[PDB]
């Protein structure tokens, strides 16, 4: 009612929507703006609907906030736009659930288009998603971002179904497919994979994202093949906000997650990272992150046997601990209620490095700050909470 008056005080409002990648993109945009000492209004993952976004503007509105960066559930777009009009809007992707009523995506995309029709909103659309580029009919200022062909080989064929053209209903011809419906499409009705304004030429994850966006290198501190599109969507928003290529490069190279999944830490020249592992598959993945890191490493491996973890620690002998002999390691710190199981596992793995047993998770995690190497923290589930708290305590710059 009288609440929209807060939205008129801010000059630029950015909406982030889509089925996957809303939080990562929204955090990347907000973190880069906050790193540039720009006062912004920002919401969280647990408040991207009507009532959550409304509360966000009230608690954070100051005379200094000039940019509003908020993520929004695509189902809440018609209700929110009845009271808020943003300057630009970015869409990541749209994915049908395996068990989703036939055409659920098509109806939803049409419901969003009729709401955002006209209104002079700058639409930042993913050129590789055909159902996202369908929104080009709802505005006149369209900015396309995408990924060049053969830029990266994704783990694909998760869904190999046939998608229809959102403009005429015919089968979409694909010149190149990244994964699922994301790719380079061209229909002779005119609807095609449009030319991208900001395009990723190549990238890799070893062990973090290293992006090549318009002939510029970006050494980020987040992982995941699918986060490359989420970072580019953030790059598109920040470029349209006036930030040059160097300002975005500063904020992107320092952002990281905060849930213990490939989370990065740094204090002066001390580098550390934490990644959960609770099964043989996750353990082999966390150990393979160390081989891709430069210089010597120092490990902290935690193994609890609580109810949430299970009382059977047999799975640690199915993981490949023998691969640690191929890495330069100062010492390995084992912790948890079953720390001696890890020490015996490493002894049988013939890992001939100094092993230190400290059953307390807090004292063992803080013990890595005494070493100059890259700390690799590998806890199981119930060990994640105490280990992550200690790392946040040991890294305060």
Residue 189 annotated as binding?
A: yes
Please list every residue from 138 through 197 that binds Zn ion, using CB under 5 A: 165, 167-168, 170, 187, 189, 191
Neighbours of 50 (CB within 10 A): 16
Phi-psi region of 219 (alpha: psi -120 to 50; beta: other; left: phi over 0): beta
Give the residues lining the site for another protein (CB under 8 A): 311-315, 317-318, 337-338, 340-341, 343-345, 347-350, 357
Residue 168 annotated as binding?
A: yes
Q: How far apart, in whole angstroms, are the C-alpha atoms of residue 241 and residue 11?
A: 11
Residue 303 annotated as binding?
A: no
Q: How near is the Cβ of 189 to Zn ion at its closest, in Å?
A: 4
Which residue lies nearer to Zn ion by CB, 18 or 166? 166
Q: Which does 344 bind (CB under 5 to 8 A by kind): Zn ion, another protein, none?
A: another protein
Q: Which does 345 bind (CB under 5 to 8 A by kind): another protein, Zn ion, none?
A: another protein
**What counts of helices (H) and strands (E) characterise the chain?**
12, 17
Which residue lies nearer to Zn ion by CB, 150 or 186? 186
Q: Is 127 in the site for Zn ion (CB under 5 A)?
A: no
Which residue lies nearer to another protein by CB, 172 or 339? 339
Q: How near is the Cβ of 347 to another protein at its closest, in Å?
A: 5
Q: How near is the Cβ of 321 to another protein at its closest, in Å?
A: 10
Residue 343 annotated as binding?
A: no
Sign for the pseudo-dihedral over CA of 223, 229, 232, 238: negative
SS3 198: strand
Q: How near is the Cβ of 142 to another protein at its closest, in Å?
A: 55
Going edge to edge, which strands form the sheet with 12-17? Answer: 40-42, 67-71, 12-17, 88-91, 122-126, 142-147, 198-205, 209-213, 217-219
Asked whether the beta carbons of 150 and 131 are under 8 A apart, the reply is no
Which residue lies nearer to another protein by CB, 112 or 349? 349
Q: Which does 337 bind (CB under 5 to 8 A by kind): another protein, Zn ion, none?
A: another protein
- Distances in whole angstroms, Cα of residue 208 to Cα of each of 147, 262, 334, 363, 369: 18, 8, 25, 28, 22
DSSP class of residue 278? -
Q: Which does 294 bind (CB under 5 to 8 A by kind): Zn ion, another protein, none?
A: none
Q: How far apart, in whole angstroms, are the C-alpha atoms of residue 142 and residue 136?
A: 7
Which residue lies nearer to another protein by CB, 150 or 347? 347
Q: How far apart, in whole angstroms, are the C-alpha atoms of residue 9 and residue 61?
A: 9
Which residue lies nearer to another protein by CB, 95 or 315? 315
Asked whether the beta carbons of 365 and 335 are under 8 A apart, the reply is yes
Q: How near is the Cβ of 361 to another protein at its closest, in Å?
A: 15
318 noted as active-site residue: no
From the list 312, 318, 320, 370, the catalytic residue is 312
Q: Which does 168 bind (CB under 5 to 8 A by kind): another protein, Zn ion, none?
A: Zn ion
Q: Which does 189 bind (CB under 5 to 8 A by kind): another protein, Zn ion, none?
A: Zn ion
Q: How near is the Cβ of 136 to Zn ion at its closest, in Å?
A: 13
What DSSP assignment string belongs to 177-218?
A: EEETTEEEEB-TTS-B-PPPSEEEEEEEESSSEEEEESS-EE
User: Which residues of the shown chain bind Zn ion in the complex (CB under 5 A)?
Assistant: 165, 167-168, 170, 187, 189, 191
Binding residues: 165, 168, 187, 189
Binding residues for Zn(2+): 165, 168, 187, 189
Which residues are marked as active site?
Answer: 312
């Amino acid at each position: 009612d009288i609440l929209r008056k807060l939205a008129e005080q801010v000059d630029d409002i950015v909406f982030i929507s889509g089925t996957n990648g809303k939080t990562t993109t929204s955090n990347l945009i907000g973190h880069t703006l906050k790193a540039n000492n720009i006062q912004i209004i920002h919401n969280n993952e647990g408040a991207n609907m009507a009532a959550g976004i409304t509360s966000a503007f009230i608690m954070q509105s100051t005379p200094k906030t000039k940019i509003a960066v908020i993520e929004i559930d695509e189902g809440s777009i018609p209700r929110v736009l009845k009271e808020v009009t943003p300057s630009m809007m970015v869409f990541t992707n749209f994915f049908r659930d395996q068990m989703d009523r036939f055409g659920e995506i098509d109806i939803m995309v049409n419901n969003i288009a009729e709401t955002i029709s006209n209104k002079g909103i700058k639409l930042l659309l993913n050129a590789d998603d055909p159902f996202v580029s369908r929104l080009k009919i709802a505005s006149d200022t369209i900015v396309y971002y995408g990924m060049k062909a053969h830029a990266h080989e994704f783990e694909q064929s998760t869904m190999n179904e046939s998608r229809y053209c959102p403009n005429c209903g015919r089968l979409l011809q694909y010149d190149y497919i990244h994964y699922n419906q994301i790719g380079h499409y061209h229909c002779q009705c005119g609807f095609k994979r449009e030319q991208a304004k900001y395009e990723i030429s190549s990238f890799d994850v070893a062990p973090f994202l290293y992006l090549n966006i318009n002939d510029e290198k970006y050494d980020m501190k987040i992982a995941g093949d699918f986060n490359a599109y989420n970072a580019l969507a953030a790059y598109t928003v920040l470029r349209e906000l006036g930030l040059n290529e160097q300002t975005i490069k500063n904020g992107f190279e320092t952002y990281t997650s905060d849930n213990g999944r490939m989370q990065y830490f740094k204090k002066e020249r001390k580098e550390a990272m934490i990644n959960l592992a609770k099964n043989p598959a996750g353990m082999n993945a966390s150990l393979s992150v160390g081989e891709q890191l430069e210089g010597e490493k120092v490990y902290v491996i935690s193994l609890n046997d609580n109810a949430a973890d299970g009382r059977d620690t047999s799975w640690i002998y199915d993981a490949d601990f023998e691969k640690l002999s191929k890495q330069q390691i100062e010492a390995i710190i084992v912790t948890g209620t079953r720390a001696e199981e890890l020490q015996l596992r490493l002894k049988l793995a013939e890992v001939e490095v100094p092993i230190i047993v400290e059953r307390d998770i807090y004292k063992a995690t803080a013990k890595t700050m005494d070493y100059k190497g890259f700390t690799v923290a590998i806890p199981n589930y119930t060990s994640l909470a105490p280990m992550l708290e200690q790392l946040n305590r040991s890294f305060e710059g």
